[model samples]
Target chain A: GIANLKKVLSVWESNKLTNTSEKFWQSVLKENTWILSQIFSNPTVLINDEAYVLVDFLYANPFSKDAVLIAIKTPSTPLITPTEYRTGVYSAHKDLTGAVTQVLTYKTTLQREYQNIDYNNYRQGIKTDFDIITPCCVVIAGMFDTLTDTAHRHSFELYRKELKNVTVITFDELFERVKGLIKLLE
Target chain B: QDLDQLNTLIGIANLKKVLSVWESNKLTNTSEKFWQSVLKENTWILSQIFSNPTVLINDEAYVGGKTVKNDSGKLVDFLYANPFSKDAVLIAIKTPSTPLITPTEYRTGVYSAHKDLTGAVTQVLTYKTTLQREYQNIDYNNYRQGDIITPCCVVIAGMFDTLTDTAHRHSFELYRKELKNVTVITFDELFERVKGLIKLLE
Candidate 1:
């Protein structure tokens, strides 16, 4: 599935998203985009902006029950302030908290779009079978320093604990998954 | 699989003495803390039961352990990882004296029963749930490390031999069938299997 990442994305690199316009994202993805989207890869483009939500380059005769809402941030965007692993109330850095909140907001947006009756009734649209409970907020940002900062580890781990179907991950992990998938294809 | 290696390590004459190792170390009874500390002190017993490539045993030996999700943190046991499948195997150790299964009702040779097992059953399952959810964090967001996923629970409790009753056997079989990724083996069952693996049976 991921073997498509390398070849599929360069299609978008040639057509950098010039705007968050609906027209741009619609044309941005294709069938190959659909495959990588299974793992929620940004095969369309590196996603230059943070203001919009996009459909996972989707396919209707499909397996994904819900949209995998992804948010992109630079590796050093300071999503989390590292701390020592200890007892008492756990506090996530304000930015890390914001990252999670923003992704949740994006999930809500996807829900609204799916539940839109006109769209749902459209010939090729997703119907009421949408998986709304799986709210995902993925961050393609800074590396998690779990080995050294045990406290940060708790915060990172708790993010999933607190948020059920919601998930947070790194660009490195995605890259690694793609590489493995590529090898399997060969 | 690992039971075979340990069988070569035991003999019927020496079985009583070798089993003595687990007893002298006080493996037969009481608090989960006692099991955790002693098992941490000697992971080899844990190792002898499971075939490897080994669950990554914490050699640091968490003589002092953690709460790990919903666990009371007191009776809590341990968790480890297998190399090949990237499975997170969570361990729950209760005393040998604990009842293996309790016969609650019997009808037409079909028995309705409750396991004499401790809350360790649910506790390790809790760890499994948390580890699975926390996979993104545990392996540095490396989902591949999380991807070849098998989250299993291991309960070393009670006695495999004691459940000779039709009700106990039926109920125990039912419990094992109900569990998805959990394996329960009593100390005696494990010891016997370890013995069965040896060529001394010849």
Candidate 2:
């Protein structure tokens, strides 16, 4: 019954991708497009969903004029998402593009698999599995993620200076410089 | 014989005086160093009196009302029988013969019961004050500072014991009540109370 209700609600909520009787879908699409555009353009470095690259950068290079410029040009984003983005940027910068793609692919698969399930039921199932030696595995994965996120944020801030000076910076470097600058000013 | 008699009396008097003051002051809890110093000085004075036989000889003869030849024989007999006969004479001479010879009124400048208590209380209070000032002046960022509360508590407990003992021995009921009224504290109150008591003593 829960599974049926979840499917029904998802369809009802998304309108089966064609159920719009008003302009709400149009507005939603426009907003999402704007968000995507902004995310693509922003250059600020984000830490592991906790702190901003700007803050880390400013703290590291308090008097650097380039850091100040990066800070001034950076746009704001929520801490958690931006930090994830910052990590992706750093992974790309470290020539770990394959690992980054793999992570994205895994996350996409998880999202696709869980998208139709009632989150609560899915979590209950997860916990049942988690009780049988899975919790430790999950914990270890979490610890690894935390360390990776931290390292990525640190490397992002470190690379921001070079990114700022380059005329044609890579997307990863550009994002780091912009995000790092925003965090510094903030 | 005359000198021996005088010395015996003086020794008894002095012992009685020392014991009376010690009892009345409740100085049992005083640091060993302070008590030892006082005792050593007092013993030296007593010893001086013992060694000088000529000073008490006339007084001894007068008190005995005996001829010099007879007094000499008595002295020899007394010394042979009592090795500490001179000490006995000294105590007798030192003991207060009348009510007028209270420690406060004694001509030799020996401390009264109140004086001893006051001195000890003052010293302890001064030490507490020094501790308080040091606590107050310390840099908070560098060092955690507060009154040495536990040591002060111990000192107060000790003082209370001494006060109780002194009051009981002196038979001064009013002074006893006053001593009991003193309170222990962690800070300035302890110093203030001691200072107030010292003023009362004066």
Candidate 3:
């Protein structure tokens, strides 16, 4: 059974060795929302309207019935600063923060057009009824390996928790979920 | 956009592949080792039961599984910890072949719970109590001081299909709901989730 997901997992691993762009991953995630399904229950990739700025991906969040906008960052990017800002504390790298800020912009702009935007139109030309209120923004950046020690892991976890709705998930964590699903499949 | 859809095709293929596996597992009567290995490897299914996310910290997790003051070699099937609260969760596995209730009605309409069912429930409860009492001696690794206390228990046993009689099914359902901190789920129910997920992909 895992032979099924193993191929998909292998593709991910292959991408690790090669140079993969943010656009490449966006294309991958757009088609395979099942990968995103690991996080969201009902995952659907929403297309951005011409009036709105281009987003990496916009997903219909089943829990909120609102949209969740994701910003993709390259897996090679560092998640945390190399040195501790304070005792046992590490700050988020600019790359990670930049992706998050991009998502924030998408969330804000998408919300601003709630009245003019058709909820049904964004779902890949499907007819569905759901509002696009304050969208949950996320930055799919970094890898857990960047946070080496216990202190580093603690600092990274603490910082991510601080940004309530704007979640930052590492590439390793996301891949781990895919591996987890493979185990279930087996 | 009609750009190359290979990834989409692969994704769909992988989903259907898993669904077939799930179907096979559901139909076959496997061993406790089989179920244990399946669940221990896939901790995400554990989170599906709980509203919040959980991570599997230990497998064959020792709750002393006992001691100088008290001791038996009772090991839990899995020990999971919540990411947010850091609370512990204990899980025990029983085979799908196990009976949910007595085949015959005890009094024409009322069905009695099978000893196997009650026994599995008691085993998980004991595992929870043992962990709670022996938590001080346990190495939490990176978990904080209060992380592993008062752990909830879950028992994965028997299929919902086994209870052919409505009265038996009712009794089983009622008993499970009444249990305080323990959760009981059928093997079929767990796999059906994977099936449902595959359906979503399709």
Candidate 4:
């Protein structure tokens, strides 16, 4: 249940607000690790990571072997090509490249590890899987400035188009989502 | 879509015109033949898709071989093409009492109305899926139509009266939006949309 995430996010945001530093963010994340894991496992909605294509990691969050699960990195810097401060996350392919390629590779690995299982409800919450028509992923990365782009706009759009999936987003989007949750709780 | 053709078939001057004549009919009394015949005779009067020129209907029927069939092996109810989209609208008809959904509280929430909604969706999706995949290979048969970005699967069923008023409307939309590929329009939903379509005196 989202109430689970609400409690976890509340605990993290209340005391962890001032700890904006990188090490502090992840270290504090482990405090309510169960809550974080529970949110992903609850079925339907988001995952996190660098914008890299993951072939090695089976799941960053509780994942479904029945459905294609994508792991996204948490830094927003790489999502956009030319960061305002200058350097960006990816050198070869930026924007959604890390998440998109990661998903495609996961699909490749998924088929290789494929099994014919009866996961009807899980897949739909996830769909009609194995052959896996729709996609599901999570990105714990930076801001998705859908509009204000420094050429980062086209890349994101291209990736979105190329990777058409039922994606549940987090991170930059998560910040606001948390507020909405807090408001719901409030 | 030919609003003219649809208007011609509706026979009524406008959608707003209420037909109290059939208002009291129990859906069970009519049988599947009556539902399908009334709709086929009228052409696109079902509000989900309101019209089309007869020239584009791909008449006689696009059987497309015996490729798609229900578990009992009966082919789909009927097939028609929407002139605007050049894609087919695969129709599956059921009477108002045809329990498309059972409110497992048996009468309350979203899934309650369209309980059979998912099965209906998957059923029609199978038809459309087969058409898209095997159509090119089948050189001859009774079914044929549009490019199908996603063929709209329309099922005309359920007691529209059961879903009127506030609470049920909320539940209707909740389940309706959950579908991946299917449109379950109770006779009421269709008739209302058709009724709202135009305001003309009889």
The collision pairs in model 1 are none
lDDT of 4 by residue, B90-192 (tens): 6776666755434433222222333344334434554555555444333234345323334556666776566555545554554454444455677767666
Off by over 4 Å in 4: A1-186, B1-10, B13-21, B28-30, B47-85, B106-114, B139-149, B164-167
Q: Estimate each model's TM-score.
A: 0.37, 0.16, 0.53, 0.40
**Candidate 4's TM-score:** 0.40
Worst 10 residues of 1 chain A by lDDT: A45-54
Model 4 residue B21 CA deviation in Å: 6.0
State the lDDT of candidate 3 residue by residue for B21-75, as single tens digits: 6577766756777767666655544553332344322234322111111123323
Summarize candidate 3's per-residue lDDT along A71-173 as a digit string, tens digits. 7777888878888898877888887777777778767776776655654356546454344544467788777876669988888888887875687988777
Please report the candidate that would top lDDT against the real structure.
3
Which is the leading candidate under TM-score?
3
In Å, residue A41's CA in model 4 sits off its true spot by 14
How far out, in Å, is residue A51 in model 2?
80
lDDT of 1 at A8: 49
**Model 1 C-alpha lDDT per residue in residues B38-150, reported as the tens digit of each score:** 55544444555565323322222221222123242321122324234354345666667676544433233333222335234544544555555554354564555664244
What is the lDDT of every predicted structure here?
A: 0.46, 0.27, 0.61, 0.43
Mark the regions of model 1 whose C-alpha exceeds 4 Å error after superposition: A1-186, B1-18, B22-28, B56-85, B106-108, B113-118, B138-149, B197-202
Give the i-RMS of model 3 in Å.
Answer: 11.9
Per-residue lDDT of A1-186 in model 1, one digit per residue for the tens? 443566644543443322324344344433334433545442322221221222232212234444355655443434344432223213334344445444554555566765453353554443333344455545444445332455455445544344344455543454455455667777
**DockQ in order:** 0.01, 0.00, 0.03, 0.02
